[PDB]
């Protein structure tokens, strides 16, 4: 049966300013089936308080979800989103680049 791999974008809600409150987002889209595990990482460690949008889907039936958490960016803290899905042999890690 149909299996479509998630697209992944990791990004902040507002342009990142050190010391200013924000939301870190990981948007996963274009995937099927709907089972998926998505973590946000701070310096390589899983962030505990992470929420997500209600499961919905696009015209082509592929699913999308927004995972998000409050954060205050700093110069040196590193963030990433880690995603696993049946289409992935190993979890895919995408680093946050305060510019994409």
């Amino acid at each position: 049966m149909i299996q479509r791999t998630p697209k992944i974008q990791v990004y902040s809600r507002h342009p990142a300013e050190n010391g200013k409150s924000n939301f870190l987002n990981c948007y996963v889209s274009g995937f099927h089936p709907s089972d998926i595990e998505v973590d946000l990482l701070k310096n390589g460690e899983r962030i505990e308080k992470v929420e997500h949008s209600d499961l919905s889907f696009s015209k082509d039936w592929s699913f999308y979800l927004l995972y998000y958490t409050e954060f205050t960016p700093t110069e040196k803290d590193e963030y990433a989103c880690r995603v696993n899905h049946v289409t992935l042999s190993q979890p895919k890690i995408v680093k946050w680049d305060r510019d994409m």
Partner: protein
């Protein structure tokens, strides 16, 4: 402009792990306003927009009643489909349904939809005339016949042309401040020296609503489609959207390139240039 109301339903069987998962969400345009999740404690249809929160107990009781009945239909359907495709009872399978309506700028009916998928592929859908069906395969031709014989299209037509548009109008009036707004994109460019002889130019659109937008790059006015990196439009989380488009430009040619931004919120399309 034109508007839409859409409901999206996903049911996932979980054999040996309990009753199937059922999630329902409702949108007006690109704004979610309700949800139901079978796995949540409340077992109610719940508001997801502040402008629906004040709808009364009649509203919530009724939407809860109906969404539960949707859930039960889908639960039966998973069994039915498993039988139709001669599939084992061990595996997880997915049904998805979407229905709703579009209105024009005068808030009058434009189009209705009711579509169904099994395991991520079309199964059956109501045709545009709202009187006939598109069966995607041999199994679905049987549902097509059954639903023809039961005059299901007529039930749906009545809702899509009447009820659906009436409710969409009500939501638009009550969520006026949120829904009838356009937030034009806030735009900027970034420049990053990939190397000593190339730089990436990235054109950003942020904080816009609705989601539909076009971003393109030109070089000397010639479109650079094949050389443009475009990302999918993505939610900011606060009800607005973001998108970017990038081109990698050679040495000192930055002035040849222009980013073009088209959005319902803009009085005129924008033409942006690094300098």
């Amino acid at each position: 402009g034109s508007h839409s109301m859409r409901y999206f339903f996903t049911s996932v069987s979980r054999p040996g792990r309990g009753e199937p998962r059922f999630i329902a969400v409702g949108y007006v345009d690109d704004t979610q306003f309700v949800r139901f999740d079978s796995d949540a404690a409340s077992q109610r249809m719940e508001p997801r927009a502040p402008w629906i929160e004040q709808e009364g107990p009649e509203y919530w009781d009724g939407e809860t009643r109906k969404v539960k009945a949707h859930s039960q239909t889908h639960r039966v359907d998973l069994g039915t489909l498993r039988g139709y495709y001669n599939q084992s009872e061990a595996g997880s399978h997915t049904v998805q349904r979407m229905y709703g309506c579009d209105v024009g700028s005068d808030w009058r009916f434009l189009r209705g939809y009711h579509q169904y998928a099994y395991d991520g592929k079309d199964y059956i859908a109501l045709k545009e005339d709202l009187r006939s069906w598109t069966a995607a395969d041999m199994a679905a031709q049987t549902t097509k016949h059954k639903w023809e014989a039961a005059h299901v299209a007529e039930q749906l037509r009545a809702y899509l042309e009447g009820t659906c548009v009436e409710w969409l109008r009500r939501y638009l009036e009550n969520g006026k401040e949120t829904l009838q707004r356009t937030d034009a994109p806030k735009t900027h460019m970034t420049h990053h020296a990939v190397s000593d002889h190339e730089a990436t130019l990235r054109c950003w659109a942020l904080s816009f609503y609705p989601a539909e937008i076009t971003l393109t790059w030109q070089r000397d006015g010639e479109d650079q489609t094949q050389d443009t990196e475009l990302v999918e439009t993505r939610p900011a989380g606060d009800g607005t959207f973001q998108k970017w488009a990038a081109v990698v430009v050679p040495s000192g040619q930055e002035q040849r390139y222009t980013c073009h931004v088209q959005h319902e919120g803009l009085p005129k399309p924008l033409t942006l240039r690094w300098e």
